[PDB]
Design a protein around this ligand. Structure first.
Ligand code: NA
Length: 461
């Protein structure tokens, strides 16, 4: 991903986009009951905590483009992945506007809280004014489609979230590229059934885990993996994607019956953005945030891993490559041990910056004991080993509970954390509940006890 140019939006006929400048995150009733070191991300150039230029920091993610064309390994990767997907008999017909808007089997309805993007954001027109979830009305939307069409600019927002001290001082805040409601709708109409087919088939065939339920899915993963596991993290995955990777994705889509609408991928690859009073053009880089983002990042990941294995290990049997991606996150396996370090090396030549799994300093062997997926470990249940617990460490949960974005969602926020934490065991869970109940706010919450969550878990399979 590389920014071609950037300039005042007025110079190209666009209005200044108003974005919030004050975080919605404030210390919660548990701020001093639990240990934590993260704070709200810098949202503006004037943030006192900054120790470097903000604008420069937030756009530096666009490391550039390392490859122009789709090489022979990539083509091979494309044929193999496309072949697997073929086995799912994915419905290739476009999805009607009604479902693309209000959802259907395998596809949730459009999120009414998220941005409507340009130009609605500049006309103060919200989604709540465009769609009727109880009416399933598509006339207003249809009229808007006909009026403003598609391929509209994406609106760049700084993500309001918790970040480490270092990242705050270095202005390393993450960005959200909200596509226009029109594009989101047109895209869900074009790829709606693909999205659904993926949501309904999380696994090693789609090579995707998007739409999955960790509590149930974790028990299916081990059975799908080959003997030897391997993994690694990416640095700035989305932004590092070169145009070739988008072209490789289009080839996959063509081969599975969607060659009919690969043009929509161009909108993602070569895209223009609106940020504050500026407008810029980017070549490459996946717009982090758009409808389809995680699924397409996941598909491209399947292409990347395959490409690197072909490039590094001629004769590798991709039919025994068992991997599951969630955007840039990935858990993979092969009957034989592979060198993540070597793969990482091959990765550089493809514009990908790969590093040791889970922030390690060196590339160590990945095992069922130390592997994580979506920040969760895998732990067989003590009483019924065939049931696998997705275990997220208490550290991130402690960090999260120390802040709130709205006092009205305190019980939902805390219940949410409880569904994640109890998997760490009863001793830990009870310690967690006790601290919560050491302050008034917590004692007033309705939280499930351990045995209740355990029973609920067993009854969910
Ligand atoms: Na782009």
């Amino acid at each position: 991903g590389e920014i071609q140019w950037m300039r005042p939006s007025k110079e190209v006929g666009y209005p200044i986009i108003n974005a919030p400048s004050k975080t919605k995150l404030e210390p919660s009733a548990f701020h001093y009951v639990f240990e934590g070191v993260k704070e709200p991300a810098v949202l503006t150039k004037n943030d006192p905590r900054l120790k470097t230029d903000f604008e420069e920091a937030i756009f530096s993610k666009y490391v550039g483009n390392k490859i122009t064309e789709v090489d022979e390994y990539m083509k091979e990767a494309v044929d193999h992945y496309a072949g697997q997907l073929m086995s799912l008999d994915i419905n290739t017909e476009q999805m009607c506007l009604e479902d693309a808007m209000y959802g259907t089997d395998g596809l949730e309805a459009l999120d009414l809280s998220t941005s409507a993007g340009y130009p609605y954001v500049a006309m103060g027109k919200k989604k709540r004014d465009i769609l009727n979830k109880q009416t399933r009305d598509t006339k207003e939307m249809q009229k808007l489609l006909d009026t403003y069409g598609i391929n509209l600019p994406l609106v760049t927002y700084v993500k309001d979230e918790l970040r480490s001290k270092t990242k705050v001082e270095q202005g390393k805040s993450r960005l959200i590229e909200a596509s226009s409601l029109n594009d989101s709708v047109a895209m869900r109409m074009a790829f709606g059934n693909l999205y659904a087919a993926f949501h309904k088939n999380p696994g090693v065939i789609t090579g995707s885990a998007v739409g999955c339920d960790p509590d149930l899915f974790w028990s299916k993963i081990p059975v799908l993996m080959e003997e030897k596991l391997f993994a690694f993290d990416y640095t700035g995955y989305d932004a590092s994607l070169s145009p070739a990777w988008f072209e490789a994705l289009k080839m996959v889509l063509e081969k599975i019956g969607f060659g009919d609408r690969v043009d929509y991928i161009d909108y993602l690859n070569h895209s223009h953005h609106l940020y504050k009073n500026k407008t810029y053009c980017v070549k490459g880089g996946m717009p982090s945030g758009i409808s389809g983002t995680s699924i397409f990042n996941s598909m491209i990941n399947n292409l990347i891993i395959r490409t690197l294995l072909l490039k590094t290990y001629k004769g590798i049997d991709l039919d025994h490559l068992k991997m599951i991606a969630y955007g840039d996150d990935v858990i993979a396996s092969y009957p034989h041990e592979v060198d993540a370090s070597l793969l990482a090396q091959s990765g550089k030549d493809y514009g990908l910056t790969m590093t040791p799994a889970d922030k390690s300093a060196t590339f160590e062997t990945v095992t069922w004991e130390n592997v994580t997926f979506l920040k969760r470990f895998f732990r067989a249940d003590e009483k019924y080993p065939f049931l696998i617990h997705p275990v997220m460490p208490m550290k991130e949960i402690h960090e999260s509970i120390r802040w709130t974005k709205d006092p009205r969602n305190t019980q939902d926020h805390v219940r949410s954390l409880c569904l994640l934490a109890w998997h760490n065991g009863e001793e830990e869970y009870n310690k967690f509940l006790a601290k919560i109940r050491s302050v008034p706010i917590g004692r007033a919450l309705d939280l499930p006890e351990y045995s209740t969550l355990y029973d609920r878990w067993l009854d969910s399979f």
